[PDB]
Design a protein around this ligand. Structure first.
Ligand code: AZG
Ligand code: ZN
Ligand code: ZN
Lengths: 182, 188
């Protein structure tokens, strides 16, 4: 709580993720790093979800986010919202497709909820890469909410390419561990 | 570099600091539309929202669109109002045990992002002024909201009212389009 701002603090691992230079060229290298943030997040009292904004072609890491809903007292503090918002703050624009910016990609541990679906559309990212599916997320009692018919087509029609199931099995291993062992 | 930090302009800090009780829907929405006009004057978009105690009218928090000045595409009025209400009441869930029922009063029907945010927030009531068609007829974009989003909220025990002070909300959207241009116009 602050008089004069909405302020979501980041746990140490996530401050480090957002300030340590990191270039990950391969799609699986990007998603592997996002899954490292999942496990660090769970250890830091957060939900089993992480995402990062990368420059699409180089794989330069711009920003990372994790679920901070409960410790942050903020239902909007999904991984995707934090990653997109922190990337925008770093690049000084609400619009990651502004002229001069390199094309940006959101790499996410799970397919977005209806709120984060909207956030992706507003953000200016040109690519979304997901590991776990809505079905995998719903099957451990998280709720994607009423996502419109053909949410993938909705993103694709707006110039946002969608890839799903990348390291899904590894993402499912961490989700199942969260369900059992947490 | 260690936080998501969305700064609030002074008028919005003022709005979040002063105790205020507005019983009637029209009183609540009247105050939300004052914040629309103040926000336009502070380089923001023509959108504002506030969380109230549904049954007492006590204001809990207000938000405005700070997308462009705040360099944050998530900084929609609804996201700021719901999040600031959560920070103030110290919970992610505005329906947590012991909290009064909360109401989001918004200058326009929520985009698909904000629709999802309303579902997760714990508010039990949504009250809107401008319709989605009003906002999209004047060049804005609410994005692909699911079929019967109002039915979707009502089925989750979130009551929906729309069109409240729609005429004043439309007047602000139209006055904003007029002055929304690079050529200096001292009238603005
Ligand atoms: N569906 C879903 N649910 C949550 O609680 C989340 N947190 N971060 N991304 C998220 N996605
Ligand atoms: Zn989400
Ligand atoms: Zn919105």
């Amino acid at each position: 709580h602050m008089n004069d701002a909405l302020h979501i603090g980041l746990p140490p691992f996530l401050v480090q993720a957002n300030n340590e230079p990191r270039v990950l060229a391969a799609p699986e290298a990007r998603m592997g790093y996002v899954l490292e943030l999942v496990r660090a997040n769970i250890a830091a009292d957060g939900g089993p979800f992480a995402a990062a904004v990368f420059e699409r072609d180089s794989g330069l890491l711009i920003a990372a986010g994790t679920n901070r809903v409960v410790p942050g007292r903020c239902s909007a503090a999904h991984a995707e919202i934090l990653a997109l918002s922190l990337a925008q703050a770093k690049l000084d624009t609400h619009d990651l497709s502004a002229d001069g910016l390199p094309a940006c990609e959101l790499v996410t541990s799970a397919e977005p909820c209806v709120m984060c679906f909207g956030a992706v559309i507003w953000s200016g990212v040109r690519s979304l890469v997901c590991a776990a599916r809505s079905d995998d997320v719903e099957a451990i009692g998280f709720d994607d909410g009423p996502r419109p018919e053909n949410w993938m087509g909705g993103l694709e029609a707006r110039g946002i390419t969608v890839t799903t199931g990348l390291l899904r099995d590894a993402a499912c291993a961490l989700l199942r561990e969260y369900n059992a062992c947490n």
